[PDB]
Amino acid sequence: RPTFYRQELNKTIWEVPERYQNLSPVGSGAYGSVCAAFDTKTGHRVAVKKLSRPFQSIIHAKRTYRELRLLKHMKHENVIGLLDVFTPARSLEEFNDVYLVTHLMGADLNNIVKCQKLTDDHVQFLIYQILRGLKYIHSADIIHRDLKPSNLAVNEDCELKILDFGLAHTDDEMTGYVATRWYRAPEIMLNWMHYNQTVDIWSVGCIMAELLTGRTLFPGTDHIDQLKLILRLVGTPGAELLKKISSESARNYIQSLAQMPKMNFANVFIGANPLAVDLLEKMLVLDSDKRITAAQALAHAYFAQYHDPDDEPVADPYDQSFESRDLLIDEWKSLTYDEVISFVPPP
Numbered sequence: 001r002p003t004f005y006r007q008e009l010n011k012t013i014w015e016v017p018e019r020y021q022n023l024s025p026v027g028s029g030a031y032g033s034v035c036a037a038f039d040t041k042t043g044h045r046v047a048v049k050k051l052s053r054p055f056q057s058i059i060h061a062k063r064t065y066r067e068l069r070l071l072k073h074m075k076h077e078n079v080i081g082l083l084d085v086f087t088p089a090r091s092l093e094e095f096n097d098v099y100l101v102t103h104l105m106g107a108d109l110n111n112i113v114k115c116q117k118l119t120d121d122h123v124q125f126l127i128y129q130i131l132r133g134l135k136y137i138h139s140a141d142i143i144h145r146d147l148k149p150s151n152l153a154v155n156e157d158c159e160l161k162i163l164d165f166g167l168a169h170t171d172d173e174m175t176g177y178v179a180t181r182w183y184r185a186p187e188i189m190l191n192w193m194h195y196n197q198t199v200d201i202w203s204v205g206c207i208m209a210e211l212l213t214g215r216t217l218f219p220g221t222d223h224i225d226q227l228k229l230i231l232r233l234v235g236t237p238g239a240e241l242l243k244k245i246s247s248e249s250a251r252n253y254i255q256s257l258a259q260m261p262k263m264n265f266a267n268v269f270i271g272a273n274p275l276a277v278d279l280l281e282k283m284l285v286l287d288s289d290k291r292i293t294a295a296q297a298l299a300h301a302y303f304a305q306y307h308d309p310d311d312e313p314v315a316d317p318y319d320q321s322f323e324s325r326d327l328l329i330d331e332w333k334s335l336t337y338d339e340v341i342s343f344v345p346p347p
C-alpha cells in the first residue's frame with residue numbers, strides 16, 4: 001500500500017498517494033470534483049476525480065459500480081482508459097471514498113470547430129477515429145448514448161478520444177435551446193422505443209455535418225421544434241416505421257404533421273465531397289434498423305486513405321449481467337471495493 005497525504009483544495013479534502021503531485025482544481029460537477037496533477041510514476045499529466053457521495057443510495061451505489069466496471073474494461077486508442085483507481089481506506093469497513101485517474105485532456109472538438117468549418121482531409125481523419133472507437137465499444141454491446149463535440153478530446157496532431165460515457169441526464173438538462181439534446185436520435189429524444197447502439201450512429205452523422213458546415217445541424221429550441229427540423233431533412237415516416245413506434249400517442253402526433261419528402265443532401269451540404277454526402281445519407285436515416293453500422297462505415301470509400309481492417313480491433317467480451325441484479329447498498333459497495341483492490345495498471 002502506498003503512503004497517502006492529505007490536503008484541502010477549494011473546501012474539499014483530498015487524500016492521495018505520494019506519486020500524485022501539484023494538485024490544482026479544474027472543475028466540479030454534480031458527480032465529483034476534478035484536479036489536474038503530475039504523476040511522478042509515469043510522467044503523465046493526469047486528471048484525478050474524487051467521486052461525491054458515491055454510496056448515498058442504491059441508485060448512486062450502482063452507478064458508481066457501473067462507472068468503474070466500464071472504465072476498467074476500455075482499452076483502445078480512440079477511447080478514454082483508466083490509469084489508476086484508489087481509496088485511502090485500509091478495509092471494507094472504513095471504505096467511503098473513490099478516486100479515478102485518467103490522462104489529462106486538453107481541447108475538445110468544440111475548441112476547433114467553434115463557429116468554424118474544417119477541411120475535408122481533417123473531417124475524414126476525425127470521423128474515421130470516432131467510428132474506429134465506436135466499432136470497439138459496440139462490439140462489447142456497450143451504447144455510449146451521449147456522443148457530442150464536448151465529449152470528444154482532440155490534440156494538436158488531430159488525434160481523438162471518446163469520453164464521458166452515458167451512465168444514465170435529467171428532464172431539465174434536455175429542455176430548450178441546449179446542445180445536450182441537439183445530437184440525440186429522434187427515437188430516444190421522444191421515447192418512441194428502446195435504446196440500441198444505432199442511436200450513436202445518428203449522433204456521428206450530426207457531428208460530421210457540423211464539421212463540414214461549421215454550424216449545428218438540428219439546433220432546435222425544444223423537443224418538438226427539433227423534431228420538425230429533423231423531419232424536414234430526412235422526410236416524414238412511412239407506415240413501416242410508424243408500425244414500430246410503441247407509443248400510440250407518439251404515432252398519433254407524427255400523423256398530425258403534413259407529409260414531407262427526403263431532401264437532396266447535395267443541395268444542403270453545398271460543396272462537400274460527394275463521398276461525404278453519400279455517407280451522411282446512410283447515417284441520417286429515420287428508421288434505426290436501416291442505419292449503417294460502425295463496422296460497415298469504416299469500409300466506406302470516404303475513408304480509403306485511412307481504413308486498415310487489420311488495425312481496427314474489437315473489444316474483449318463484457319459481462320453486463322449486474323444491470324438486471326437487485327442488491328442492497330452495502331452489496332454494491334462491496335462489489336466496488338473488490339474492483340478497486342483488483343485493479344492492474346496498464347504497462
Ligand SMILES: O=C1C=NC(=O)N1c1ccc(Cl)cc1
Pocket residue numbers: 117212213214268269270271272
Ligand atoms: O457542407 C459544406 C462543405 N463546405 C461548406 O461550406 N459547406 C456548407 C454548406 C452549407 C452551409 Cl449553409 C454552410 C457550409
Ligand SMILES: [Cl-]
Pocket residue numbers: 002003017018019020
Ligand atoms: Cl505513491
Ligand SMILES: [Cl-]
Pocket residue numbers: 079080081082103
Ligand atoms: Cl486513455
Ligand SMILES: [Cl-]
Pocket residue numbers: 087088089094095096097098
Ligand atoms: Cl475511504
Ligand SMILES: [Cl-]
Pocket residue numbers: 110148149150151179
Ligand atoms: Cl457539445
Ligand SMILES: [Cl-]
Pocket residue numbers: 317318319
Ligand atoms: Cl467482463
Ligand SMILES: [Mg+2]
Pocket residue numbers: 150151164
Ligand atoms: Mg462531458
